[PDB]
Design a protein around this motif. Structure first.
Motif, PDB file in Angstrom:
ATOM      1  N   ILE A 401       0.999   4.765  32.359  1.00  0.00           N
ATOM      2  CA  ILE A 401       0.789   4.924  31.160  1.00  0.00           C
ATOM      3  C   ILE A 401       1.381   5.798  30.898  1.00  0.00           C
ATOM      4  CG2 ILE A 401      -1.648   6.129  31.340  1.00  0.00           C
ATOM      5  CD1 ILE A 401      -0.891   2.951  29.323  1.00  0.00           C
ATOM      6  N   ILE A 404       5.126   3.823  30.348  1.00  0.00           N
ATOM      7  CA  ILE A 404       5.391   3.021  29.501  1.00  0.00           C
ATOM      8  C   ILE A 404       4.406   2.859  28.588  1.00  0.00           C
ATOM      9  CG2 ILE A 404       5.837   1.090  31.640  1.00  0.00           C
ATOM     10  CD1 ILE A 404       3.184  -0.065  31.222  1.00  0.00           C
ATOM     11  N   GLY A 407       6.174   3.152  24.859  1.00  0.00           N
ATOM     12  CA  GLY A 407       7.142   1.443  24.768  1.00  0.00           C
ATOM     13  C   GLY A 407       5.924   0.603  23.666  1.00  0.00           C
ATOM     14  N   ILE A 408       5.108   0.785  24.829  1.00  0.00           N
ATOM     15  CA  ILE A 408       3.850  -0.271  24.616  1.00  0.00           C
ATOM     16  C   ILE A 408       3.377   0.066  22.536  1.00  0.00           C
ATOM     17  CG2 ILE A 408       1.630  -1.312  24.700  1.00  0.00           C
ATOM     18  CD1 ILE A 408       2.323  -0.173  27.682  1.00  0.00           C
ATOM     19  N   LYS A 410       4.870   1.382  19.987  1.00  0.00           N
ATOM     20  CA  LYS A 410       6.146   0.705  18.711  1.00  0.00           C
ATOM     21  C   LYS A 410       6.584  -0.549  19.382  1.00  0.00           C
ATOM     22  N   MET A 411       5.956  -1.279  20.161  1.00  0.00           N
ATOM     23  CA  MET A 411       6.037  -2.783  19.927  1.00  0.00           C
ATOM     24  C   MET A 411       4.664  -3.245  19.534  1.00  0.00           C
ATOM     25  SD  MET A 411       7.213  -4.098  23.898  1.00  0.00           S
ATOM     26  CE  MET A 411       6.594  -2.676  25.019  1.00  0.00           C
ATOM     27  N   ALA A 412       3.638  -2.605  19.628  1.00  0.00           N
ATOM     28  CA  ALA A 412       2.054  -3.154  19.044  1.00  0.00           C
ATOM     29  C   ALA A 412       2.233  -3.365  17.651  1.00  0.00           C
ATOM     30  CB  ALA A 412       0.953  -2.188  19.780  1.00  0.00           C
ATOM     31  N   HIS A 420      -4.111  -2.107  19.855  1.00  0.00           N
ATOM     32  CA  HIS A 420      -3.324  -2.735  21.394  1.00  0.00           C
ATOM     33  C   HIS A 420      -2.559  -1.236  21.257  1.00  0.00           C
ATOM     34  CE1 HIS A 420      -4.265  -7.004  20.727  1.00  0.00           C
ATOM     35  NE2 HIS A 420      -3.600  -6.769  22.013  1.00  0.00           N
ATOM     36  N   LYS A 421      -2.591  -0.726  19.952  1.00  0.00           N
ATOM     37  CA  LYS A 421      -1.847   0.697  20.160  1.00  0.00           C
ATOM     38  C   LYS A 421      -2.366   1.413  20.834  1.00  0.00           C
ATOM     39  CE  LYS A 421       0.298   4.376  17.095  1.00  0.00           C
ATOM     40  NZ  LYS A 421       1.352   4.622  16.360  1.00  0.00           N
ATOM     41  N   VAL A 424      -3.529   2.538  24.115  1.00  0.00           N
ATOM     42  CA  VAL A 424      -3.057   3.142  24.343  1.00  0.00           C
ATOM     43  C   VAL A 424      -3.035   4.879  24.687  1.00  0.00           C
ATOM     44  CG1 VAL A 424      -0.106   3.903  25.118  1.00  0.00           C
ATOM     45  CG2 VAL A 424      -1.111   1.395  25.352  1.00  0.00           C
TER      46      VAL A 424
END
Ligand SMILES: N[C@@H](Cc1c[nH]c[nH+]1)C(=O)O
Ligand SMILES: N[C@@H](Cc1c[nH]c[nH+]1)C(=O)O
Ligand SMILES: [Zn+2]
Ligand SMILES: [Zn+2]
Lengths: 433, 433
Positions: A401, A404, A407-408, A410-412, A420-421, A424
């Motif tokens: 975790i 990745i 990156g998650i 930033k996409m969330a 979602h962000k 993480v």
């Protein structure tokens, strides 16, 4: 003064192929209200509806919907020793080939600390529909029952309609009992599909329903999808396309065409040849062999809608076949290994002069429950895959975790999904703390 | 004076589980006539219908349906370097995991002289639907586009509706262009599904359509099946079920629940715990974290239909989960390797405290296009398998047909299919002669 049964086309242009790939038209009756009415009766009256519809359409007034053990025992004693041996030979080959389709677990490390894989699990409740009549297509019992068992499906139901005396053909009962199907119900048509879709007192509802049938069964399976059940594939009449060069045996090719044609008046066969002499010899064989068929009337009706086509190369024949997308493809040609890579749509393929379609229908081990009417463009034949779900698994470590995670986040953020962000973020802060 | 958002059940009896597994009810509007009317317009007016329906529902009067190369270039320049890096990281992991799903050719000799095998072939024409709006769910482009490319699908179409100015979100265009999708069309709703089902002057018709959408898109995909197109799976709102023991982190579990809840008011989350203290701590975290969500209104509506349940063992929790059949399953427990074999229905499974659902949504490599509303009982998530047909092949030798031939003849006789029997007989007599 010769009565030619099949129409021929000699080197048609590419502009006519759109017309030459057409199946015969199908009936355009709207059956939705008819099906929904039966489904409502099954929902409200359950076993009583099953018995009432069986009385109406099968002309049998049943007391029990379920086939009894005495009936199974009676059926076993009515199957000859030679047929028993043949069915066991077929079952062994089907079992061997479908067992080979099981996959091994394969753990993939997509990136450091992230492991992903899939595992198969059976679809728990399986429903199988088998049409009735005087000629038992018991081979379909093997084709659908064996991979269901191999997948680990716990509850297998088989519905098949009684004759007017309440009986089921002995070969069906023998074959279902052989491969361990114990829940066998005297029911056909829309009402059988409805019973497996909604369940009754006697029939537990299915998660997925398999097996072709007539226009009413086909519409019922299509509409049953809207109440949550899965189905194997769309339906239609069976068909074969044969590609033949100068090494093909015209007697064999004619017999293969006639084997498909005798299935039903709505069947279609297509013969592609690389020269006219092969076509003429094969058609002569068709005419001569047709005279000997007990089902010659049915095959003759199918031949009316069939086509023999001369095309000037095997690669052109393959291109025509790929546009047609046949349920069965027979390559009656030399050196098939040079051509199979070029096949892009076909349900099942038979290679060389000794691979007849009858062998795949019965005993080679492949599945004969196959997409027809061009559905080979977007469906497969039934296989072990049809009876399972492939569940994906992942295990992400603390390092995973951390790898990745940013990156998650930033996409969330870009999808404006703050929770979602945050899911993480709380892991990262925990390890950073 | 505390406002509790989620309802709880402490050791409910097995007689109540039937009620506790229920999703919230869905809308019961009959959309068939609405869909069929749009489909008729697409069939008759083609591109003109696409433009007219886009004017009506998207409030954009387009001249061109197809996204231009200048628009793709403009979109690329509007995506930040940090997002580009994150999307490439996700694409690499998704590509790696789906590439691993390719099978090796495996020739099976079922019996002497009979060789059978399967080979994959791509579905030639793929259609992808991506909903619009201000928040681009561009991650779905990766999830559907990447396995399509890996399968060898030659024609990939992507439809996504414009905003009122005619524009598509730059992250969607960037991501589709990244993975090589070149046919991108400004179209949404029923009319987009109809365009991919029947084809227009600008949009070639699809063999299979992928991607979830609203109630209208869902009904259109369901009805499109009746015109010959395949679809990925049935639709519904997203959901998660979490199983938590004393080793779970209540802050993590609350964040996972809220990540699913913020998707939509119709989402559902289920929390199963092995003791009440874990439930109470997790709910406290939910309440505190909820206050910080920009989408707190949407998540709060989903929590109204959500449930926290205490069950007195992990094996009971698994049994509840198997009855519920969740789209996503999070096992926030110790030693998950002792329990994964007992899972029988779940779309995708996340193991241990650092496997959050957001990682699978975005970047771990698994596919987030998953069966919801209990369809994990009978469907899989999208995978490489979704984009191919598995064609069966067989090659029977002269010894092969001498081996299985007599058995086939006996079965064909029993099915009263004389031409099937004769197709074998002519081969045997030829070798005997
Ligand atoms: N290897 C898997 C089987 C599977 C089929 N597809 C994906 N996985 C298992 O352990 O059950
Ligand atoms: N091994 C096959 C791939 C495949 C997938 N499923 C069955 N076969 C091939 O050569 O394409
Ligand atoms: Zn046959
Ligand atoms: Zn999500």
């Amino acid at each position: 003064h010769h009565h030619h049964h099949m129409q021929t086309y000699i080197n048609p242009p590419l502009s006519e192929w759109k017309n030459l790939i057409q199946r015969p038209v199908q009936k355009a009756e709207d059956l939705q209200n008819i099906v929904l009415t039966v489904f409502e009766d099954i929902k409200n009256e359950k076993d009583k509806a099953l018995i009432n519809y069986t009385k109406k359409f099968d002309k049998a007034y049943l007391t029990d919907i379920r086939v009894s053990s005495d009936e199974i025992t009676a059926a076993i004693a009515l199957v000859s020793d030679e047929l028993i041996q043949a069915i066991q030979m077929a079952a062994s080959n089907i079992e061997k080939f479908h067992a080979s389709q099981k996959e091994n677990k394969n753990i993939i490390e997509t990136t450091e600390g992230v492991n992903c894989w899939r595992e198969a699990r059976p679809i728990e409740n399986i429903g199988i529909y088998i049409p009735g009549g005087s000629a038992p297509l018991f081979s379909t019992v093997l084709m659908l029952g064996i991979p269901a068992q191999l997948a680990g499906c716990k509850n297998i139901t088989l519905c098949t309609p009684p004759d007017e005396s309440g009986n089921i053909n002995p070969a069906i009962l023998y074959t279902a009992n052989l491969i361990g199907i114990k829940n066998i119900y005297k029911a056909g048509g829309i009402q059988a599909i409805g019973a497996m879709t909604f369940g009754t007192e006697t029939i537990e509802k299915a998660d997925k329903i398999f097996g072709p049938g007539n226009q009413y069964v086909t519409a019922a399976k299509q509409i049953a999808q809207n109440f949550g059940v899965a189905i194997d594939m769309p339906a239609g009449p069976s068909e074969v396309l044969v590609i033949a060069d100068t090494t093909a045996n015209p007697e064999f090719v004619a017999a293969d065409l006639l084997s498909q044609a005798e299935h039903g008046a709505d069947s279609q066969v297509i013969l592609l040849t690389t020269d006219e002499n092969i076509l003429q010899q094969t058609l002569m064989q068709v005419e001569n062999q047709l005279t000997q068929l007990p089902r010659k009337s049915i095959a003759s009706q199918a031949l009316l809608q069939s086509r023999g086509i001369v095309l000037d190369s095997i690669e052109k024949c393959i291109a025509f076949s790929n546009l047609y997308a046949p349920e069965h493809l027979i390559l009656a040609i030399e050196n098939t290994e040079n051509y199979t890579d070029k096949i892009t749509s076909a349900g099942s393929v038979f290679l060389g002069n000794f691979s007849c379609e009858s062998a795949g229908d019965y005993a080679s081990g492949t599945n004969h429950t196959l997409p027809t009417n061009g559905y080979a463009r977007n469906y497969s034949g039934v296989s072990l895959d049809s009876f399972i779900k492939k569940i994906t698994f992942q295990k992400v470590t603390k390092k995973g975790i951390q790898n990745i995670g940013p990156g998650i986040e930033k996409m969330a953020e870009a999808e404006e999904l703050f929770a979602h962000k945050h899911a993480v973020s709380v892991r990262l802060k925990s390890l950073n703390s």
